[PDB]
Amino acid sequence: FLDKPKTEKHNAHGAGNGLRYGLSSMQGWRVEMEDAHTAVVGIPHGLEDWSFFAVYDGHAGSRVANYCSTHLLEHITTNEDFRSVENVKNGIRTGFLKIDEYMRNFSDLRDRSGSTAVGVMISPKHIYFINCGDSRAVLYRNGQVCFSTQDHKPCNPREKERIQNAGGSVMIQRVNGSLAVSRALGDYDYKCVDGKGPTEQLVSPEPEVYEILRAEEDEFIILACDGIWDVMSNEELCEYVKSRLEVSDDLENVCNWVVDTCLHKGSRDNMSIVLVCF
């Protein structure tokens, strides 16, 4: 932690495919910035009617977060499982596994970094929520929270079971008393258990994928990391954003307001939020 937070924001925004987005990231109280993001409206080479947005919360360095931000989408869309809902979901799963294996082979990783990843792939008919770690995506529809991804915490029943089966333990709500997420990309020190596949390791790169039919009543999706969700609940943040959209249509601005509000509520983390309005 710094003595004084770096409150400078990086912002971006864009529009297309019947969406508008804004985003904001801030280093905040932490000594390093290790978050990254992806915002693609109109996926090229065939997926022009689709969009993808993601937030990556890095730890023990930026290297994994940064690489995901510019390569995960490629890994998802170009594998043989991706190339129907079934196939999209498998393609996403395959992309996560292949990037985790690929990154492992870089000279610096053979660097101890890891990253969460949360995203949405938006098609003309479906939203695919994607989660790996304790970042979170939430959908607001018809004036209510409609959907939330499930945070991957070591204390969760099935996460604890896998961890125990891999010879670890959950102590102080952390993997072997150190890692505060039970799923992530990178973190290779937690993926060296003999006799276990990639998805059976102390920390798993397997994402959970939730597909949701799109509705005319869809209002917005929020993607943010635990530095936001730590101080605001799903309903609390949705209602906040809703109240801000009442006075501003500048999504960068709205996102900056969210981030500053969470800082004032005491969040000492790096923070990244992406707001996608329909």
Ligand SMILES: [Mg+2]
């Ligand atoms: Mg964080």
